[PDB]
Amino acid sequence: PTHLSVDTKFKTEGLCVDIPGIPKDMTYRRLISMMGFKMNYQVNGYPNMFITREEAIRHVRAWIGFDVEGCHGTNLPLQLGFSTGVNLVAVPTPLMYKGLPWNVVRIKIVQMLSDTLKNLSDRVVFVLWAHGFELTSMKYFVKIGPERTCCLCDRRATCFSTASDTYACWHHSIGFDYVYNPFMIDVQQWGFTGNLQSNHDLYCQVHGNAHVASCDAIMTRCLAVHECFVKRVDWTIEYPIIGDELKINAACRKVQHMVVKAALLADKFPVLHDIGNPKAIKCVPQADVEWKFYDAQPCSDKAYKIEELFYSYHSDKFTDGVCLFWNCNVDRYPANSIVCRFDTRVLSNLNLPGCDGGSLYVNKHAFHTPAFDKSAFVNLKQLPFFYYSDSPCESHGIDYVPLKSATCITRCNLGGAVCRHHANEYRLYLDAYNMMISAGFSLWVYKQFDTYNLWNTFT
């Protein structure tokens, strides 16, 4: 049991207003046939156009919400809406495009999906709240067949061209007119009562209903993300490397060690309260401090209330020493804190749009993160960039230009001239820092933090 059986039942109640008379007893096999597609008994990698909830979750980067609304069914114009905010009007003769025949509409669909997905996924998963017109419109822009490879590379084919009779992936599809072997899932099959807006609005206040197809497409995808990544969480699912994952994760470890080590040297806290990931290891193993750990899994719905994390009777006194909240999202951090908080607003290939202002950060695992809120940091300040090192000034073993920087906190800089080793390490550290910041991570610290207190650790 890996793929969704075509002989699985499909509930058709949601389809009967667009398709009146539709049989109550229906399989994916018969639905695909009704949609105008012929599977020809093919064992060539594409067993069903529809996929399971488990397969949809493994391919969350491919999710594109899709809705079709009748403007006036062969005789009427259709408004095609996508979770990218795009609305296209197809005539059978929040971006809104005027009515155009299907032969040109399909070219725009291929361009839009290819630009949206080329850096995300090897496929497309159309996320539906199926009422009929979206399923019966697929024949106008979708072609199916055996699994194929791109004409210009080794990636699987996602597009077809009737001009050249060739296949392409999302990177090589310029000028292609058909979406080839897409996947889809109907959210209505999951067991819901009431319409799309009533279910979506139970969990999200950020997406409205401007009564256009793209609004429904966005709400459908948002509801799917809430069901799969907010109310249900699976951290065992691994996701492929599509970008700077490894560098970002290594940079995060380097920045955490640097900042915590310097906070302990500068203010000499007798105790550190490490709140978050139950599998955390001391980021500064050599530090003298009493290191106490508190378990809190990543919050995916709302940020933790600091009253629930801290109160209800541990050193008990979280006011003693310092608190470390490394990606542990709380509503309002205490004044004595070191914080790394992911900014959900960041634009990147790892950060997908989420539910109720939140975002779906996908880097090895999927983490739905609550909406970034500047008011969480009112008792803290932004942590300034700095590099600190007590290591010996010694080169060992990439040409050189002398480093001059007020933020290179080393013995050599105190002595008036940065050594080659510390200049190389400073530049590598600054690169790691900038990588982590650009990935969306934000750093905050207790107001008394002052790197001037690090210079006297060289005596």
Q: CB atoms < 10 A from the CB of 272, how many? A: 25
Q: Among ligand WKS, Zn ion, none, what binds residue 150 when CB lies within 5 to 8 Å by partner kind?
A: Zn ion
Q: Among ligand WKS, Zn ion, none, what binds residue 212 when CB lies within 5 to 8 Å by partner kind?
A: ligand WKS
Q: Among Zn ion, ligand WKS, none, what binds residue 204 when CB lies within 5 to 8 Å by partner kind?
A: Zn ion
Compose the 214-233 pattern: x for residues touching ligand WKS by CB under 6 A, - for all others.
-xx-----------------
Please report where in the chains the tokens 């940065």 appear, as a residue. 418
Catalytic-role residue among 69, 177, 186, 356? 69
Q: What whole-number distance in Å separates Cα of residue 67 and Cα of residue 74?
A: 17
User: Which residue in 214, 220, 213 sits closest to 197, CA to CA?
Assistant: 220
**Which residue lies nearer to ligand WKS by CB, 134 or 216?**
216
**Which residue lies nearer to ligand WKS by CB, 86 or 215?**
215
Q: What whole-number distance in Å separates Cα of residue 189 and Cα of residue 176?
A: 32
130 belongs to the binding site for ligand WKS (CB under 6 A): no
Which SS3 state, helix, strand or coil, does residue 205 take?
A: coil
**Which residue lies nearer to Zn ion by CB, 348 or 424?**
424
> Nearest 5°: phi and psi at 100?
-150, 150
User: Which residue in 133, 129, 130 sits closest to 76, CA to CA?
Assistant: 133
**Which residue lies nearer to Zn ion by CB, 53 or 171?**
171
Q: Among ligand WKS, Zn ion, none, what binds residue 169 when CB lies within 5 to 8 Å by partner kind?
A: Zn ion
Contacts of 61 (CB under 8 A, 6+ apart): 117, 120, 121, 239, 242, 352, 362
393 is in an annotated binding site: yes
> Nearest 5°: phi and psi at 409?
-85, 85
216 carries an active-site annotation: yes
153 is in an annotated binding site: yes
Q: Between residue 38 and residue 77, which ones bind ligand WKS under the rule CB under 6 A?
A: 69-70
Contacts of 63 (CB under 8 A, 6+ apart): 56, 83, 125, 127, 221, 224, 225, 352
Q: Which two tokens stand for residue 282?
A: 């001391």
**Which residue lies nearer to Zn ion by CB, 5 or 424?**
424
Catalytic-role residue among 18, 59, 134, 421? 134
> Nearest 5°: phi and psi at 263?
-65, -40
Which stretch, 5-13, 275-283, 291-299, 392-400, contacts Zn ion (CB under 5 A)? 392-400
343 carries an active-site annotation: no
Cβ–Cβ under 8 Å, residues 170 and 109: no
User: Which residue in 184, 155, 185 sits closest to 170, CA to CA?
Assistant: 155
196 belongs to the binding site for Zn ion (CB under 5 A): no
- Judged by the rule CB under 5 A, the positions of this chain that interact with Zn ion are 150, 152-153, 155, 169, 171-172, 204, 207, 222, 393, 410, 412, 419, 422
Feature table: binding site for Zn(2+): 150, 153, 169, 172, 200, 204, 207, 222, 393, 412, 419, 422
Q: Which residues are catalytic?
A: 67, 69, 134, 211, 216
- Judged by the rule CB under 6 A, the positions of this chain that interact with ligand WKS are 69-70, 211-213, 215-216
